[PDB]
Amino acid sequence: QMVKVLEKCQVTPPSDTTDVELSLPVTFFDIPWLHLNKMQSLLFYDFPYPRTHFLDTVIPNLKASLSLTLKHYVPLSGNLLMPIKSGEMPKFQYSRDEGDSITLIVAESDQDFDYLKGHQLVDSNDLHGLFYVMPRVIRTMQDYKVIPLVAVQVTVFPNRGIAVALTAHHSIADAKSFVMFINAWAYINKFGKDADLLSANLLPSFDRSIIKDLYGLEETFWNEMQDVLEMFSRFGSKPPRFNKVRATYVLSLAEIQKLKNKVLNLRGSEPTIRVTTFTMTCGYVWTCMVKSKDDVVENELEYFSFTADCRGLLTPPCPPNYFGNCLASCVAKATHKELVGDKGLLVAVAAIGEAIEKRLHNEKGVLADAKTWLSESNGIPSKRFLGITGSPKFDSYGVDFGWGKPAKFDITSVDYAELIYVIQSRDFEKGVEIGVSLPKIHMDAFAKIFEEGF
Known about the structure:
The active site is at residues 170, 400. By secondary structure, this protein is an alpha+beta fold. It has eleven helices and 18 strands.
């Protein structure tokens, strides 16, 4: 590692313009995600300015803007409170009398910045190295442990660029919500204290009185998770040495059409299939991902799990800007023989759409079968699995602290699993950037089959 830390500090919300306390409940949507304490989000920026300007001006204004935007995102300055004793339930808490506050790390790195941001093969470890390791438990009260929610590590590459590296506990925000926060923080820094986050649709909602647990999912989800939380809680927070490299792929909207029509042409008349930019991009990626395994050296089932934002399907109406987890587990299944065969792309896209219709588009309600979300996931062999985090809906390249849009946005937390992430493309309007992570021998296999599909 060539990352040297310059300063560690604490960012609090504004004093005397906040409540001394804010307690927040743990809805049944948040419970599946309680054991995941890393939802990393890296953002590289071109910054052709002297390290002096960085420290003199850039760090203050970020420290400054972060404080202001915290008065609208208060829970992010608090912690998660995990129960130590049976019969108590988790919660979120911000106590200003505890000096609750996000840890900012001011760092300086001496690596090649144009390398760390590129789309060509990038060592995944170099990327995890730019993130601060949040503690597992910052203090133990008498009912619950206190687990931190957010830390950011700003890191300068002198005369090259800046890398903003955030780390959120997955209990407090899903992909949509966490990107809203990053975009408010950027927005208030760029424009200033008199920045209208409401008008910009970057104003959260923490009211969960309208989140109602009508199917008793909260009780069921807690008890299934009990086993998981014990096992996964004893993982020291340091990033393991990943034997995985990162590569980045870009599809135009037109290259999605070349995939769309490829599916339509493959005589997908028989049953009409739903063909969207999302189901396309996964469909094609999953198909390549399955084939890559073979070229490295069966006829079992391959699974592809993804999340879906229920905020729009809930009842009562749940605000679009509701902050927190609000996701649905979807698991496509398909035959290895079929996904690698002549109709592989067509099989995959059909499979992914057939998973949303039974789950999300379940014409009986989203939560109708939700007592099963937690018990399908575990029935996936780790050997036959693909996952996708993020969504083209989220404005990942709109995070502009005042230096321009980002050079790259990397959901770095993918390496912890057989995952890919799909992000709004930076340079193409309705395109997508697909972040893939694989060992290099494997990764070469992927890209080959990825290139050949056109």
